[PDB]
From Swiss-Prot, chain B:
DNA-dependent RNA polymerase catalyzes the transcription of DNA into RNA using the four ribonucleoside triphosphates as substrates. It comes from Streptomyces coelicolor (strain ATCC BAA-471 / A3(2) / M145). Coiled coil: none annotated. Residues 94-114 are annotated as: Disordered. The RNAP catalytic core consists of 2 alpha, 1 beta, 1 beta' and 1 omega subunit. When a sigma factor is associated with the core the holoenzyme is formed, which can initiate transcription. Mg(2+) binds at D244, D246, D248. Belongs to the RNA polymerase beta' chain family. This is DNA-directed RNA polymerase subunit beta'.
From Swiss-Prot, chain C:
This is RNA polymerase principal sigma factor HrdB. Residues 67-86 bind DNA. The gene is hrdB. The lineage of its organism: Bacteria, Bacillati, Actinomycetota, Actinomycetes, Kitasatosporales. Homotrimer (Potential). interacts transiently with the RNA polymerase core complex. Interacts with RNA polymerase-binding protein RbpA via its sigma-2 region (residues 211-347) in a free form. The chain holds residues 406 to 510 of 511 of the full protein. Sigma factors are initiation factors that promote the attachment of RNA polymerase to specific initiation sites and are then released. This sigma factor is the primary sigma factor during exponential growth. Its activity is stimulated by RbpA. Belongs to the sigma-70 factor family. Residues 41-94 are annotated as: Sigma-70 factor domain-4.
Curated annotation (Swiss-Prot), chain D:
GO terms for biological process: DNA-templated transcription initiation. Its EC number is 2.7.7.6. The gene is rpoZ. The keyword Nucleotidyltransferase applies. Belongs to the RNA polymerase subunit omega family. SMART domains: RNA_pol_Rpb6. This is DNA-directed RNA polymerase subunit omega. It catalyses: RNA(n) + a ribonucleoside 5'-triphosphate = RNA(n+1) + diphosphate. HAMAP family: RNApol_bact_RpoZ. Keywords: DNA-directed RNA polymerase, Nucleotidyltransferase, Transcription, Transferase.
Curated annotation (Swiss-Prot), chain E:
One of its GO terms (molecular function) is DNA binding. DNA-dependent RNA polymerase catalyzes the transcription of DNA into RNA using the four ribonucleoside triphosphates as substrates. GO terms for cellular component: DNA-directed RNA polymerase complex. Pfam families: RNA_pol_Rpb2_1, RNA_pol_Rpb2_2, RNA_pol_Rpb2_3, RNA_pol_Rpb2_45, RNA_pol_Rpb2_6, RNA_pol_Rpb2_7. PROSITE patterns: RNA_POL_BETA. It catalyses: RNA(n) + a ribonucleoside 5'-triphosphate = RNA(n+1) + diphosphate. It comes from Streptomyces coelicolor (strain ATCC BAA-471 / A3(2) / M145). Its EC number is 2.7.7.6. SUPFAM superfamilies: beta and beta-prime subunits of DNA dependent RNA-polymerase. This is DNA-directed RNA polymerase subunit beta. The keyword Transferase applies.
Length: 194, 290, 105, 77, 1116, 91, 151
RNA sequence: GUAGG
């Protein structure tokens, strides 16, 4: 992790210089070594997740309670306007509303209905700042967890059938991009632990 | 004290007595599981457990010999120490100091050593097993195929479908009897290939790549004969496997039972997995050229 | 056996060599079809003829019976049973009940 | 003339699930395959194909054909 | 003059120094080891030239260091004065054919001398056949060609390290002395503000006890060390005093459990460190330590001295004190600093000679202990040098090194280049060195000392990234074991025609300039500003006359393989690595052609490799035939070179050899007479050159798949021979002998149709899967004929005979014509191993044509699997009707950042169609005219040195001035793109397309090898689960991740069958097979066996693993 | 299959599992290549190497399976029983 | 919230996006146990991991018995530790550790209930996930009477 | 060991 005072001054069209080429291989070999290690570590991590994530299978049609989770439906609302959350998709889409929402004295989104583009856009237009979505964390199921709390499956785009193994799909999704991450601090900066 | 309470209560609630700490009669592995299988060339193949058992029984014999006659305390005590060393090496070789290196090039295997780790029993021969009715080959790109079609080479197909092609050949009277059918398929006549072309359709095959990061590794497809010696594959699904075409061998399996092929047609079919399970977006629409 | 052969993944040399005690399903099912066809072909013959040949070759029980040994339960004399065994040899050796069994060897 | 020829959505709405559809179609496929493999006993419990069939056919395809027709019915014990 | 065929050169700078012999590394090292006439001749040549060189041969040295053995009485001695060799008994061809280790006799004159007898008895004795290495460089053992690869290991020396401990919040300094052979010792200063010793890291202790145990007194100790407070604190806190007290205390600590003994402890210390035999410091180690510690001429060979220990202590304390320059103990002033292990001033290479010498040394150590034991148990006057020595350890050790040793590797023979490369590798993996699990980030990465000592570009891509690397182009080996690099001398700003060889530490002091830097017409620099490199890998420039050394050739950092790739400068290193790794796998073809565009060094790479056959004399050829070529020098010596023809290589490719020279043509020494595989006119040719165009095409080149015309299938342009050889053995078993015969039992007639009289396949008879090659029958076996089979025999009247068929058959999925058959027999004069009575080898050969599935790749790393071969018409053909022979997906070349190939393709089109440049007055035209590459006829090859290649301006000008191929029109546009007419539709393509000629290589990852299938096959004995591998019909393993995916799908039943029915359940396999053949439905699965085996294993360990049901016991 | 109870195996349990015991380090004869007596690979405790074939030549047939011949005491059965049967060593 | 935010921002650093339910399942898993404190009335040890369900059952039992409950504090441990301390010995053995888990199971004399997946892939029975569930598999199949009326 | 993934 040491930057050079004299950077490369030529394009691969123009053709590097011999010294420049030597300096380039420095980083490239290091990157290759890092990838070989990152793949190994990612495989290990995936095994740990999938083993710890087992035994979580959907074994009930509908939850027993009503307690939900508070999520920010819209954020960074500039002055005189309402702006939806930047990364709303990963968070609140495909989630089950624990209870109905009334903003003008009329129900807008009915309960136990998944949320897509149209419904979220409507709620944002109405101007509600937050939302209460059902989720596994507050789920109260005598056996495992219920289908409603986990909400619709992303892959099938439909409500999760009973008996689906959610743990293994969770582990696989978490583990797959580990090889793709390949992120590291560019330079220690000459300081350790900062 | 808290740690001790745990163990004593565990002993007390269990009906078994603690005296099992001191085993007296050492079991022995059944002979087959530790085979002294004959090897061509006058040589022999032996599992190290045979050597460990030889060591322990030999030392027990010598201790019996000493105890029979009047012997000093030093020698009998050393002998009992030796017996304890042999037994411990049998259960665990290398749990204390240098292991019993046996031939000297490497340590000797032990029972516990067999049940542990990457090469152990559990993680290599109970959660992953080799399987009959499978194959492997390089995979090449064939555009004209449909989303449900993959091109199996001829030889791989015929080897894969030997019971079925044989059954149809005898049923169609192309072969006289079963032995004649086997000889016929081994010979490889055009009639065999035609029967095969008849039997493969409407029978799923699971294509599958090696890393299998996420559930889009295993994908069912309809078979379809094609010349050459390489699997063909539908270019849209390639990015689900993360499979490039520099060169990449992809395994093929068969759902043998009726229930298995029902699962292949309904669940693992290649036309019902457009969306990557991670975040709910299209994944089966690659982008390199089209 | 527990020696490294080639790479660590290849591991023990034990894996490389096949066994012999394994029942090859191909040969076993070949034998089963041979058994079924042979029993059917015997049933093609007369009841007594098939029975005497089966006892002469132990098709019901692992030990074949000698000619005189067949002439106790059936009540036939050793030469009578010898004669009809020869006639069964004649009856089976026709081209009729031979095409199916030729391919089984 | 292919796996996808019976579309899945009708079967799904018929059986109200994905896995129940699999086990149910597989049970029907097993039943019909047992029927064709009778070779002479003629057991009354066994039932022939309700839909027309080809000279050579995979049983589970006929099972799925029956389900898509919707004529065959299921009921849990 | 006529060394190589003419090839146009685009080089811009002249190269004074010629590349050395590419294979010097192995041949010269083994030459030193043997100490034959060649080594001594080279030694005297160096001496008269003034060059330093070890004057003592290896073998005689290892004999000499073994002192004559002395008993407890010291009465007797054995002197091993002179060693010698004899010519090998077996010819190299004979050794290869008959499976004999190519060795020679090695004798030595042992002289017995006993003072009690007062007599000297000389006798010559023979230690054993010594594995020799042939001139081509490979150890022939057991008929196979193996090679020992050089090993990178840290040199013996004193190594200093600095680090930071977060808990301490302060710097920590340590030192370690790495001996060549002895036990290791370390010296850590201020771990907790105090200094301490690590005598093999046995127990905690101080330094004061050590010094006190030595003869050095506290008074002189503090006098020398009164200037640094840390040592004073250590001394004062040390309560113990006196040499005896410290000595007994350290002895107790090292070996507790017994009362201390003064003399025993003293002898222990002498043995550990002062004993010459026990502590061994190589000459290199001694050489290194003195420079590091600055001691002026210590003992040239000898163990460490207390002087050395105190000097290291002084260096360590000076370093921790913050002082950076200090007087060396009994030496000149020196910088005191920490040193990085990565720098090759500390790294060293163990060439083949030193490795073999080390194993011979171990063997002679075994011999010494054995003979000492014998003398301790032998009577006087009955002792002879012939009788007392046992030669078993030496022969066994050298044998144990060439078989079953990582550094002794199978010689790849895919092509000459893979040859040379596997010769020159520096395998850091190995015994007494860095291991795979031991690897870290630091060792793998490149270091600024790599220039000239290792090609940083190329290495295996697998987990052993960078650990293995090829030698640099000009690298030569320091006699100690470092790698030197040649540098041109620079004085007062003029480059001089003198070369000096500099090592990994000498190079640091000076400043090294750049080769590509321009020079004036005179020897002075054209520009005051010149880029230079300096200590620590710094790249700062220094204008004006300041440098003293500069690189001789631009390609100093690139090994041979990486030096092949033209236009490397324009390539990302990642893809250059891919290409270099993929340049060692090209298979030769029927007809080889040198590349049209490529580096000008390929000729040397082909020449030095032994595949080519060159003449040793300068005469007139007398007879030219395929089998043999006869030459006659003017002196009168006649020599007939026998050309190997269609003999299997290591990887199974033909080693066919052509002939080039005519009948009466004059020859010169070293001139090439016959090309080897993948060779043409003495030049490397690893593939062919195809006309090629960049454009997508109906997805048949999607994701970098390739499309190639059927014309390559038509003209055998890409066709490779493949020779497979496998054998069978007749062995006398317990029951009886096995027989080879045409009378195979229980078979048809036509199967044994083409066989020989004795039951062997004739020559020329094509074979298929199931064909009988050699008929073999078991002697007998106990046959209890079954009731059903009994009846069947009775009906058909056939006799089942105890002899059983065990004949050889073609393994499944094969094809070929038999080309040769060899038989060895016991009773005949030929020797065989025990038991085996006759051995038969059969050669089956085919001509694999380029087909779908064959891998294929360009030099720059564009590799793909052929996905379709259209007829010659569907090719998008060009204006004059020339079809394109291969299509490529352009989407690669931006993302892969490897635009070298576009330069290559344009230059290839340029090379195919000659150019004329005369009187153009253009800068590029002037550059070609001065270079001389102005007038070029079509098809004549060209050279683009790796870093002095063609500039884009030159390409543009030449393209604008290409000779008209036809109709007086230039067919490619100045842009480098031409008009393509679609073959299928016929409409001209909307815009022009790029087209040219690029070299392409047929790799050895062929489909035919990889293809595999299994209905049902053999099974493993310990656990019934099917075995693996292709040679034994193994089914593909179902991995744990695989079952996780299946669990995710929820498809339980498919998992259940894939786990139980299709393997791991003996009772279910036969049942399912009968069910499928009978058409009956599949039965319910049974319990797997492996759980049963596991249960027995847990039960064997006193764990009562009991399967129990909810209602009492369970049923299984 | 309902539960895999595991726990301490007492000496009585090991004796109960054992169908006999082992007394020698003998494995096979160098010449007959056959199992020795009362040692490792001892057919008298584990089982016949060949299917329904005893050691002493007395019985080699499948018909009269399920019996012990007093000559070598081998219980004629399928060879697979060797994969299951186990003995013990007394210290 | 902190865990989901941290992991999500790390992933979004590259750009890959993962739905938050997947994380929520794992974070639920890591939080499952509770460290018991003041285990006077409950009669088991103080200061050890206990399953949340087990803790609730014990507290309900003791309060029903009239004695005051023993206290508990939610405690977080890495996935490895929670995985090892699982009621299923077979699954834990199938994990990285064998000798210790085999030993402590043996001394404990704990019978493995086969509820779960990995242990049921060991025995080779049908996994209770997807097609293998009891409700799905117990169905019986027969056509309608009008079917036989037609043919 | 060494190549490909
Ligand atoms: Mg790949
Ligand atoms: Zn819920
Ligand atoms: Zn017997």
């Amino acid at each position: 992790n040491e930057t050079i005072p004299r950077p490369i001054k030529a394009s691969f069209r123009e053709g590097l210089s011999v010294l420049e080429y030597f300096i380039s291989t420095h980083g490239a070999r290091k990157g290759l070594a890092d990838t070989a290690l990152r793949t190994a570590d990612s495989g290990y991590l995936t095994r740990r997740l999938v083993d710890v994530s087992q035994d979580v299978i959907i074994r009930e049609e509908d939850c027993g309670t009503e307690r939900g989770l508070k999520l920010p439906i819209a954020t960074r609302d500039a002055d005189g306007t309402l702006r939806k959350a930047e990364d709303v998709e990963t968070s609140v889409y495909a989630r089950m509303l624990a209870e109905d929402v009334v903003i003008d004295g009329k129900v807008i989104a009915p309960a136990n209905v998944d949320l897509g583009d149209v419904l979220i856009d409507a709620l944002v237009a109405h101007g509600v700042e937050e939302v209460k979505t059902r989720s596994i964390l507050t789920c109260e199921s005598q056996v495992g967890t219920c289908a409603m709390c986990y909400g619709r499956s992303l892959a099938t785009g439909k409500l999760v059938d009973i008996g689906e193994a959610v743990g293994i799909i969770a582990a696989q999704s978490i583990g797959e991009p580990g090889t793709q991450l390949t992120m590291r601090t560019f330079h220690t900066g000459g300081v350790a632990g900062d | 004290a808290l740690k001790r309470l745990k163990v004593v209560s565990a002993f007390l609630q269990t009906s078994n007595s603690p005296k099992g700490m001191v085993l007296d009669c050492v079991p022995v592995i059944p002979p087959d599981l530790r085979p002294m299988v004959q090897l061509d060339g006058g040589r022999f193949a032996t599992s190290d457990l045979n050597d460990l058992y030889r060591r322990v029984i030999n030392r027990n014999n010598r201790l019996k010999r000493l105890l029979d006659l009047g012997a000093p305390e030093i020698i009998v005590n050393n002998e009992k120490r030796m017996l304890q060393e042999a037994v411990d090496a049998l259960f665990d070789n290398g749990r204390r100091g240098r292991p019993v290196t046996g031939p000297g090039n490497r340590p000797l295997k032990s029972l516990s050593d067999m049940l542990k780790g990457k090469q152990g029993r559990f993680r290599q021969n109970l959660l992953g097993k080799r399987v009959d009715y499978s194959a492997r080959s390089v995979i090449v790109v064939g555009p004209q195929l449909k989303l449900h079609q993959c091109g199996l080479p001829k030889a791989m197909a015929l080897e894969l479908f030997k019971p079925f092609v044989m059954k149809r050949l005898v049923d169609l009277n192309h072969a006289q009897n079963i032995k004649s059918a086997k000889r016929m398929v081994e010979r490889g006549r055009t009639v065999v290939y035609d029967v095969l072309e008849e039997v493969i359709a409407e029978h799923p095959v699971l294509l599958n790549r090696a890393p299998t990061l996420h559930r889009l590794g295993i994908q069912a497809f309809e078979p379809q004969l094609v010349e050459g010696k390489a699997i063909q594959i539908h270019p849209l699904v390639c990015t689900a496997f993360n499979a490039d075409f520099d060169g990449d061998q992809m395994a093929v399996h068969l759902p043998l039972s009726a229930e298995a092929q029902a699962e292949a047609r309904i669940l693992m079919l290649s036309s019902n997995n457009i969306l990557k399970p991670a975040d709910g977006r299209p994944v089966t629409m690659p982008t390199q050229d089209m | 056996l527990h020696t490294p052969l080639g790479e660590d993944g290849d591991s023990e040399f034990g894996d490389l060599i096949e066994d012999s005690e394994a029942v090859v399903p191909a040969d076993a099912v070949s034998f089963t079809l041979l058994q079924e066809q042979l029993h059917s072909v015997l049933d093609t013959l007369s009841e007594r003829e098939a029975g005497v040949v089966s006892m002469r070759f132990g098709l019901t029980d692992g030990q074949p019976k000698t000619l005189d040994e067949i002439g106790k339960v059936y009540g036939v004399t050793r030469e009578r049973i010898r004669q009809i065994e020869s006639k069964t040899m004649s009856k089976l050796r026709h081209p009729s009940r031979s095409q199916v069994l030729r391919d089984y060897l | 003339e292919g796996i996808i020829n019976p579309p899945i959505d009708e079967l799904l709405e018929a059986t109200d699930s994905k896995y129940s559809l699999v086990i149910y179609a597989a049970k029907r496929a097993r039943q019909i395959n047992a029927y064709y493999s009778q070779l002479g006993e003629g057991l009354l419990e066994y039932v022939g194909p309700l839909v027309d069939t080809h000279v050579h056919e995979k049983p589970l395809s006929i099972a799925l054909r029956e389900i898509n027709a919707g004529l065959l019915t299921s009921e849990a014990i | 003059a006529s060394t190589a065929p003419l090839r146009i050169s685009f080089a811009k700078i002249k190269e004074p120094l010629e590349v050395p012999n590419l294979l010097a590394l192995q041949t010269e090292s083994f030459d030193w080891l043997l100490g034959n006439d060649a080594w001594k001749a080279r030694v005297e040549s160096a001496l008269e030239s003034g060059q330093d060189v070890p004057t003592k041969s290896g073998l005689e040295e290892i004999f000499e260091e073994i002192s004559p053995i002395e008993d407890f009485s010291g009465s007797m001695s054995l002197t091993f004065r002179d060693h010698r060799f004899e010519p090998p008994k077996n010819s190299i061809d004979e050794c290869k054919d008959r499976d004999f280790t190519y060795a020679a006799p090695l004798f030595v004159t042992a002289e017995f001398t006993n003072n009690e007898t007062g007599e000297i008895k000389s006798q010559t004795v023979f230690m054993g056949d010594f594995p020799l290495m042939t001139n081509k460089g490979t150890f022939v053992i057991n008929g196979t060609e193996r090679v020992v690869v050089s090993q990178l290991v840290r040199s013996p020396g004193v190594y200093f390290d600095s680090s930071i401990d977060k808990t301490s919040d302060k710097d920590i300094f340590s030192a370690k002395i790495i001996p060549s052979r002895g036990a290791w010792l370390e010296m850590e200063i201020d771990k907790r503000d105090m200094v301490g010793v690590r005598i093999d890291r046995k127990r905690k202790q101080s330094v004061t006890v050590l010094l006190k145990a030595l003869g050095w007194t506290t008074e002189q100790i503090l006098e020398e060390f009164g200037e640094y407070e840390s040592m004073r604190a250590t001394l004062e806190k040390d309560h113990t005093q006196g040499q005896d007290d410290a000595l007994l205390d350290i002895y107790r600590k090292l070996r507790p459990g017994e009362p201390p003994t003064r003399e025993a402890a003293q002898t222990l210390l002498e043995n550990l460190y002062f004993n010459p035999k026990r502590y061994d410091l190589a000459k290199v180690g001694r050489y290194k330590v003195n420079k590091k510690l600055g001691a002026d001429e210590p003992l040239d060979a000898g163990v460490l001295t207390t002087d050395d220990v105190i000097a290291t202590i002084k260096y360590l304390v000076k370093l921790h004190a913050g002082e950076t320059e200090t007087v060396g103990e009994s030496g000149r002033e020196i910088v005191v600093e920490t040193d990085d292990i990565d720098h090759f001033g500390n790294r060293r290479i163990r060439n083949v000679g030193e490795l073999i010498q080390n194993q011979v040394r171990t063997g002679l150590a075994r011999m010494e202990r054995v003979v000492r034991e014998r003398m301790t148990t032998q009577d006087v006057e009955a002792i002879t040098p012939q009788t007392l020595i046992n030669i078993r350890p030496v022969v066994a050790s050298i044998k144990e090194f060439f078989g079953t040793s990582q550094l002794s590797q199978f010689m790849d023979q895919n092509n000459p280049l893979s040859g040379l490369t596997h010769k020159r590798r520096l395998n850091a993996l190995g015994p007494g060195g860095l291991s795979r699990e031991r690897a870290g980030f630091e060792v793998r990465d490149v270091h600024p000392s790599h220039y000239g000592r290792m090609c940083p570009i190329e290495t295996p891509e697998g987990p052993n990234i960078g650990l293995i690397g090829s030698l640099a182009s000009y690298g030569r080996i320091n006699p100690f074991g470092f790698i030197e690099t040649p540098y041109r001398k620079v004085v007062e700003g003029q480059v001089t025609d003198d070369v000096d060889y500099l090592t990994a530490d000498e190079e640091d002091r000076f400043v090294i300039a750049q080769a590509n830097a321009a020079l004036g017409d005179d020897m002075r620099f054209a520009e005051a500003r010149v880029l230079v490199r300096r200590r620590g890998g710094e790249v700062d420039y220094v204008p004006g006359d300041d440098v003293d050394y500069m690189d001789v050739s631009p390609r100093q950092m690139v090994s041979v393989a990486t030096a092949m790739i033209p236009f490397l400068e324009h390539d990302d290193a990642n893809r250059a690595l891919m290409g270099a790794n993929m340049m060692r796998q090209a298979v030769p073809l029927i007809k080889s052609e040198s590349p049209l565009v490529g580096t000008g060094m390929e000729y040397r790479s082909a020449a030095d490799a032994g595949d080519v056959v060159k003449a040793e004399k300068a005469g007139v050829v007398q007879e030219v035939s395929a089998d043999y070529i006869t030459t006659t020098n003017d002196d009168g010596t006649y020599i007939t070179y026998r050309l190997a023809k269609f003999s299997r290589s290591n990887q199974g490719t033909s080693v066919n050899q052509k002939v080039i020279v005519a009948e009466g043509d004059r020859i010169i020494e070293g001139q090439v007479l016959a090309d080897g595989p993948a060779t043409e006119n003495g030049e490397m040719a690893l593939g062919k050159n195809l006309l090629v165009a960049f454009m997508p095409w109906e997805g048949h080149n999607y994701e970098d798949a390739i499309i190639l015309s059927q014309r390559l299938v038509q003209d055998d342009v890409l066709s490779s021979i493949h020779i497979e050889e496998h054998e069978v053995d007749a062995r006398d078993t317990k029951l009886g002998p096995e027989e080879i015969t045409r009378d195979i039992p229980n078979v048809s007639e036509e199967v044994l149709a083409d066989l020989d009289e004795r039951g062997i396949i004739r020559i020329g008879a094509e074979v298929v899967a199931g064909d009988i090659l050699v008929g073999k029958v078991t002697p007998k076996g106990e046959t209890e004929l079954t009731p059903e089979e009994r009846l069947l025999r009775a009906i058909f009247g056939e006799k089942a005979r105890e002899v059983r068929d065990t004949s050889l058959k073609v393994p499944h999925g094969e094809i070929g014509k038999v080309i040769g058959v060899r038989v060895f027999d016991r009773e005949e004069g030929d020797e065989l191993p025990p038991g085996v009575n006759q051995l038969v080898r059969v050669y089956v050969a085919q001509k694999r044509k380029i087909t779908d599935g064959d891998k294929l790749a360009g030099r720059h790393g564009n590799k793909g699997v052929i996905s379709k071969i259209n007829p010659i018409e569907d090719m998008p053909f060009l204006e004059d009707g020339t079809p394109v022979d291969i299509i490529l997906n352009p989407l690669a070349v931006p993302s892969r950042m490897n635009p070298g190939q576009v330069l290559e393709i344009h230059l290839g089109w340029l090379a195919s169609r000659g150019w004329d440049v005369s009187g153009l007055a253009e800068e590029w035209a002037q550059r070609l005219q001065v270079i001389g590459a102005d007038k070029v006829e079509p098809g004549t090859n060209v050279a683009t040195p790796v870093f002095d290649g063609a500039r884009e301006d030159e390409l543009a000008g030449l393209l604008q001035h290409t000779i008209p191929n036809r109709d007086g029109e230039r067919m490619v546009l100045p842009s480098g793109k031409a008009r393509l007419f679609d073959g299928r539709s016929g409409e001209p393509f909307p815009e022009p397309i790029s087209v040219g000629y690029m070299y392409i290589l047929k790799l050895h990852h062929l489909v035919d090898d990889k293809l595999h299938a299994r209905s049902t096959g053999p099974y493993s004995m310990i656990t019934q689960q099917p075995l693996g591998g292709k040679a034994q019909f193994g089914g593909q393993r179902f991995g744990e991740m695989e079952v996780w995916a299946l669990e995710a799908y929820g498809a339980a039943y498919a998992l259940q069958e894939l786990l139980t029915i299709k393997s791991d359940d003996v009772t279910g396999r036969v049942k399912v097979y009968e069910a499928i053949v009978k058409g009956e439905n599949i039965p319910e699965p049974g319990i797997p066996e492996s759980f049963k085996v596991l249960i027995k294993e847990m039960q064997s360990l006193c764990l009562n693993v009991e399967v129990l049901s909810s209602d009492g016991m369970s049923i299984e | 299959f309902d539960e895999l109870r595991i726990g301490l195996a007492t000496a009585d349990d090991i004796r109960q599992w054992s169908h006999g015991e082992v007394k020698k380090p003998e494995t096979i004869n160098y010449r007959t290549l056959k199992p020795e007596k009362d040692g490792l690979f001892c057919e008298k405790i584990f089982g016949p190497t060949r299917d329904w074939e005893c050691y002493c030549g007395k019985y080699k047939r499948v018909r009269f399976k399920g019996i012990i011949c007093e000559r070598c005491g081998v219980e004629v059965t399928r060879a697979k029983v060797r994969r299951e049967r186990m003995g013990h060593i007394e210290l | 919230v902190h865990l989901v935010g941290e992991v999500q921002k790390v992933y979004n650093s590259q750009g890959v996006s993962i739905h938050d339910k997947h994380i929520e399942i794992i974070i639920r898993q890591m939080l499952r146990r509770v460290t018991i404190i003041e285990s006077g009335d409950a009669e088991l040890l103080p200061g050890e991991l206990v399953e949340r369900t087990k803790f609730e059952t014990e507290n309900r039992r003791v309060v029903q018995e009239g004695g005051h409950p023993a206290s508990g504090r939610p405690q977080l441990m890495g996935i490895t530790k929670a995985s090892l301390a699982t009621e299923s010995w077979l699954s834990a053995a199938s994990f990285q550790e064998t000798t210790r888990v085999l030993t402590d199971a043996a001394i404990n004399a704990k019978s493995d209930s086969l509820i779960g997946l990995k242990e049921n892939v060991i025995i080779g029975k049908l996994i209770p996930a997807g097609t293998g569930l009891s409700r799905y598999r117990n169905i019986r199949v027969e056509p309608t009477e009008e079917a036989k009326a037609a043919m």
